[PDB]
Amino acid sequence: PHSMRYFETAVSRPGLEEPRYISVGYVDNKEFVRFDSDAENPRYEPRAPWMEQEGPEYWERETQKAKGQEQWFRVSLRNLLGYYNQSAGGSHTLQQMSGCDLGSDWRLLRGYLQFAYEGRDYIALNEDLKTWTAADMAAQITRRKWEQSGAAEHYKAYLEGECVEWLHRYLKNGLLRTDSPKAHVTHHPRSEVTLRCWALGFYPADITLTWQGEELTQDMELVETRPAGDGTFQKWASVVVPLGKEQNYTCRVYHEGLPEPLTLRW
């Protein structure tokens, strides 16, 4: 089960008629190339060891395409400005997500193309890779133009063609990952006593903790999953119980790197 994605951002500046264009490329949610128009001589750079085998021509070509896209974001920010009647000299962001998901056979599961403006959903390609979904009126004018010009056939050819092929090259140049949550519950006298279920050092980031012996609805205390910074992640989920009847609730952790869900307490 694999994936490739490019995440793109252009950000408009006051006075400087040219925006800052940053472009990151991921394989299996891991960074491997990055472009930042604010570098002195802007170029794609490897972000991982296995990219450094790709030779000079790769970097030349992809850098040229980065520059093409940059120009495209310039034009589209500029137009968006008019679509929404935004004042001159503001700051505005245009973003794009694109790429493809492969099944475990290395076949295409799904192709993805989305655009957002000012951090809001603007327009997106449906999973059929033929039609579009527009968020507001501006975006429908977009939608309308694109479906009249058949741009979807272009993006569909990319997602079914080069995105899969090149992902295959990349995978070959890279056959599986996971780390399991080491876990434990801590005790914290409220005024009553809090029980914090801890999950540490796991990868990937997706995980479910819950308390229980019926599924413990809420008064759930949880944090968004967070990176230890070593490549692993952390998360906890607490519940406030009064004294002594700790030994009545249960923490369970669900992670794909576990032989089986952990069932924890004390």
């Binding site: 395409k65 896209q69 968006l80 794009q96 977009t142 694109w146 741009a151």
Partner: peptide, 9 residues
């Protein structure tokens, strides 16, 4: 291998 856009927004 980056996508190259077609029609602008």
């Amino acid at each position: 291998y980056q996508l190259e856009n077609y029609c602008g927004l």
